[PDB]
Amino acid sequence: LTACPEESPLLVGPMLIEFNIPVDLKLVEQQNPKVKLGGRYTPMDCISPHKVAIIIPFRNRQEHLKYWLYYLHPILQRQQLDYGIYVINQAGESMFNRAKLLNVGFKEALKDYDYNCFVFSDVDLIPMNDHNTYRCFSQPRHISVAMDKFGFSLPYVQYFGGVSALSKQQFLSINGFPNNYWGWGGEDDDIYNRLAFRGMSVSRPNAVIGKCRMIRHSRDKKNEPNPQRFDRIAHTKETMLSDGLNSLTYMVLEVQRYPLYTKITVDIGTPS
Amino acid sequence: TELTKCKVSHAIKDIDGYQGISLLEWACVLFHTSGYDTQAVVNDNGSTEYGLFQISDRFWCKSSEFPESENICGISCDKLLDDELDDDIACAKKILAIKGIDYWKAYKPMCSEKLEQWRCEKP
Numbered sequence: 001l002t003a004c005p006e007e008s009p010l011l012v013g014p015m016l017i018e019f020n021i022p023v024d025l026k027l028v029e030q031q032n033p034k035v036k037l038g039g040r041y042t043p044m045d046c047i048s049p050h051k052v053a054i055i056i057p058f059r060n061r062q063e064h065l066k067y068w069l070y071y072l073h074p075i076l077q078r079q080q081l082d083y084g085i086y087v088i089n090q091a092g093e094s095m096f097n098r099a100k101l102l103n104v105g106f107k108e109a110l111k112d113y114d115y116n117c118f119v120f121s122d123v124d125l126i127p128m129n130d131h132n133t134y135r136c137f138s139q140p141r142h143i144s145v146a147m148d149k150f151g152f153s154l155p156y157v158q159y160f161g162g163v164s165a166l167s168k169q170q171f172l173s174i175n176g177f178p179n180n181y182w183g184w185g186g187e188d189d190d191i192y193n194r195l196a197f198r199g200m201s202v203s204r205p206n207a208v209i210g211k212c213r214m215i216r217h218s219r220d221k222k223n224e225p226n227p228q229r230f231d232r233i234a235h236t237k238e239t240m241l242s243d244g245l246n247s248l249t250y251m252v253l254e255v256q257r258y259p260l261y262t263k264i265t266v267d268i269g270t271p272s
Numbered sequence: 273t274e275l276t277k278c279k280v281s282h283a284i285k286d287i288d289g290y291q292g293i294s295l296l297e298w299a300c301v302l303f304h305t306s307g308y309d310t311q312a313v314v315n316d317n318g319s320t321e322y323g324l325f326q327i328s329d330r331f332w333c334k335s336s337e338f339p340e341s342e343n344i345c346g347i348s349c350d351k352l353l354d355d356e357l358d359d360d361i362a363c364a365k366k367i368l369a370i371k372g373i374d375y376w377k378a379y380k381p382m383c384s385e386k387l388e389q390w391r392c393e394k395p
């Protein structure tokens with residue numbers, strides 16, 4: 001009945017994150033008995049004020065998800081968050097639309113519980129220090145701040161890709177994310193633009209507690225560099241009014257509830 | 273071959289200033305243009321862009337698929353995929369003189385402010 005402490009006493013700090021030893025979900029499930037059907041966990045000791053929905057954009061990346069789950073579940077519990085895992089699976093073969101799947105995650109998670117915070121994470125990024133809290137702050141939160149891929153440094157100060165968090169209000173205020181970015185790149189630069197045009201800046205853990213590992217992979221098919229990203233990124237100010245939460249359309253083809261997570265398959269259409 | 277900010281700034285010294293562009297602006301541009309990957313190859317629309325600078329085979333180099341390209345730079349696009357940047361730099365230099373920095377579309381939107389961060393903090 002007690003509010004959880006500002007900082008959790010279960011934090012372990014830096015952790016070794018490797019991807020050699022193959023993972024067994026069933027074992028992971030076993031090691032994580034407190035996680036309920038659909039990837040929902042809520043602290044039984046204290047009351048967390050962080051009602052977090054972790055949203056993962058997805059498509060043929062099951063190996064990655066296994067690892068994601070194995071590492072994050074223990075981590076999110078140590079962070080004492082009231083959370084749910086949501087894998088938004090893009091059905092079909094058209095270009096990958098990261099930002100639109102995240103938008104869907106937001107709408108679809110709100111149907112299950114009244115989450116107040118939203119973490120958007122790619123399947124291939126694992127935090128290497130549990131002090132890098134997966135929650136919302138007074139400002140929009142960029143989490144995967146120092147990825148191994150960029151030599152544990154932030155590639156550019158305007159970077160908002162990888163893992164980030166927005167409270168429900170912060171998200172709503174920018175009309176959520178854009179649905180019009182198909183193919184790789186720029187949607188995160190757009191989101192960043194959106195925040196700025198709404199008077200919000202970006203909060204970030206320092207480079208040491210934000211060390212992040214990214215599971216290596218080959219550039220995915222159907223997610224090639226968007227040739228228009230640069231043009232689109234320059235009109236955020238105007239397009240953000242007509243492209244976002246208020247223009248989201250999709251069809252839910254299937255809601256799967258596994259013990260460690262909830263996976264939704266959706267048809268979000270094609271690059272119109 | 274995935275290079276880094278500093279490697280890029282070191283191999284690019286000779287293009288600094290040309291057409292008003294600094295090495296800050298170049299690292300910024302190259303990062304968003306190629307990710308600093310000398311073997312980057314991106315298909316756009318009926319044309320392919322090559323290397324660190326993503327030089328198009330539509331007008332700048334001769335590619336096995338576009339044997340009619342004006343090949344303004346007079347080079348085989350494939351020579352833009354190795355780790356010798358001299359010819360990539362020379363061609364870039366032609367693109368600047370003839371079309372200007374806006375050939376590189378990342379320039380205006382990503383590289384118009386906050387350049388301080390793009391400097392290489394190493395000798």
Ligand SMILES: O=c1ccn([C@@H]2O[C@H](COP(=O)(O)OP(=O)(O)O)[C@@H](O)[C@H]2O)c(=O)[nH]1
Nearest residue numbers: 057058059061096098122123124161220223
């Ligand atoms: O075919 C695809 C392409 C992308 N993704 C998801 O989209 C994210 C984007 O990865 P990207 O290669 O752009 O990572 P970045 O280089 O921007 O860190 C991945 O992490 C996945 O969660 C996926 O699931 N399937």
Ligand SMILES: [Ca+2]
Nearest residue numbers: 351352356357
């Ligand atoms: Ca070359």
